[PDB]
Design a protein around this ligand. Structure first.
Ligand SMILES: O=c1ccn([C@@H]2O[C@H](COP(=O)(O)OP(=O)(O)O)[C@@H](O)[C@H]2O)c(=O)[nH]1
Length: 438
């Protein structure tokens, strides 16, 4: 049996997408070693049905630990943002443990994420082929690589303009970029990406030219789950009108500022929509409460229309509920893919990293709308309220709703043939590499 070790970056969205890919590979008679920190493995274990217990094996990776950065913080999930550089550095320091794991397990292939250039380096030293799997979409990667080759030319095939807020948003950025570049360039023969041609084909073709490598889509990769946490939420949603409610979430690794929450809250209130909003506090803060993060009296004024959930909610179950008419989202790529799969239009409030590019692609495909920031880069309560009202409450953006339903139909028609290309490229790569090693 051909064995694959998978090494996601230490974020919940990365773990989730890698796990869905692991499931699809396991059904093609690959044996998977799924490698991450213990805190990440514990968070993802509930998402693996017992049907996979024999073919997907978890392997713990150990990072350097200290009382001030202990192992339960070795994840981006709820991590204080100021600890993000320490987490990247600690992950790079796991390379020797990673080498010993690869020596002991001797997998035939490594599939690695784009935040760990040390991983393909270790694999190559051990004569283990390594392929890069990207859990973002293609658009942001092609936008990042284009200036390296065409520094004086506008990006082709798109009218998207990045807001000055993010253009402004030095060596931390450069080294993360150069690490990302290495991960792409080091990949053996192909790169894998969680996207699909109907959405991003022209950008995959362009990225393939920029890299001189085949770009292989393996998307849509979307996780779909008796549940007590959803029960209370389900009971509330069951009393609402169809397509009347928005889910509001900024993902697993972002905490909007007090001012950002103010604009979102006032946008929700003015729109008169029903909403479920996930509000979170960073690890180590178990004093803070919902009431302090929100404007004074906001939940009192919202009354029956509003529900705030602390910490975490069953996002996929909520989006699939017939009451949900929209998704106010930071536009993390897994959230975008889920929203498209479930046919829910996106109201984009991107915050950082790849999100503004994802929101621009959402707008371009017409399956959602982006709440634009004002000249100074602030979220605008008026823009949030107007888009919720148009898309969900009054439903005057029927173009958006129809395109989102159309996209869902397309995505639901896809089957296991979406993995045919990846499996053939893996087979070829391993057969070429077997001759080399000989
Ligand atoms: O309260 C929450 C917040 C997030 N998610 C899931 O966490 C993942 C978030 O991934 P995404 O790429 O959207 O954003 P990130 O967390 O990486 O910024 C998605 O699968 C969401 O469905 C969830 O289930 N409940």
């Amino acid at each position: 049996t051909t064995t694959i070790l998978m090494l996601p970056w230490l974020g919940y969205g990365h773990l989730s997408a890698f796990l869905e890919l692991a499931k699809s590979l396991s059904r093609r008679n690959f044996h998977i070693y799924f490698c991450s920190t213990s805190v990440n493995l514990d968070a993802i274990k509930p998402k693996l049905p017992s049907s996979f217990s024999d073919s997907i094996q978890f392997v713990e990776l150990h990072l350097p630990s200290s009382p001030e950065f202990p192992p339960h913080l070795h994840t981006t999930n709820g991590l204080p943002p100021t600890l993000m550089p320490a987490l990247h550095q600690a992950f790079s320091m796991a390379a020797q443990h990673f080498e010993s794991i690869l020596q002991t397990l001797a997998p035939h292939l490594l599939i690695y994420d784009s935040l760990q250039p040390w991983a393909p380096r270790v694999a190559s030293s051990l004569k283990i082929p390594a392929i890069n799997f990207n859990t973002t979409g293609v658009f942001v990667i092609s936008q990042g690589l284009h200036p390296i080759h065409y520094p004086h030319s506008k990006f082709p095939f798109s009218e998207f303009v990045l807001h000055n807020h993010w253009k402004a948003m030095t060596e931390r950025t450069r080294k993360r970029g150069e690490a990302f570049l290495y991960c792409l360039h080091a990949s053996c023969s192909v790169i894998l990406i969680n996207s699909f041609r109907e959405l991003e084909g022209k950008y995959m073709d362009y990225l393939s030219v920029l890299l001189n490598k085949k770009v292989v889509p393996v998307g849509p990769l979307v996780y779909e789950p008796e549940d007590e946490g959803y029960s209370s939420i389900k009971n509330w949603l069951d009393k609402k009108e169809p397509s009347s409610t928005v889910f509001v979430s900024f993902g697993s690794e972002y905490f909007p500022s007090k001012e950002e929450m103010e604009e979102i809250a006032h946008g929700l209130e003015a729109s008169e929509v029903n909403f479920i909003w996930v509000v979170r506090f960073p690890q180590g803060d178990n004093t803070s409460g919902i009431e302090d993060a929100l404007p004074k009296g906001f939940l009192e004024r919202a009354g029956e229309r509003g529900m705030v959930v602390k910490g975490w909610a069953p996002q996929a179950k909520i989006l699939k509920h017939w009451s949900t008419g929209g998704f106010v989202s930071h536009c993390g790529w897994n959230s975008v893919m889920e929203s498209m799969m479930f046919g829910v239009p996106i109201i984009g409030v991107p915050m950082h990293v790849d999100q503004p590019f994802n929101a621009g692609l959402v707008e371009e495909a017409g399956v959602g709308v982006e709440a634009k920031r004002d000249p100074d880069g602030k979220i605008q309560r008026d823009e949030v309220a107007k888009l919720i009202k148009e898309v969900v409450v009054e439903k005057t953006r029927e173009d958006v709703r129809k395109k989102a339903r159309e996209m869902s139909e397309i995505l639901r028609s896809k089957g296991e043939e979406k993995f045919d290309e990846m499996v053939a490229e893996i087979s070829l790569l391993l057969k070429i590499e077997h001759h080399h090693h000989h």
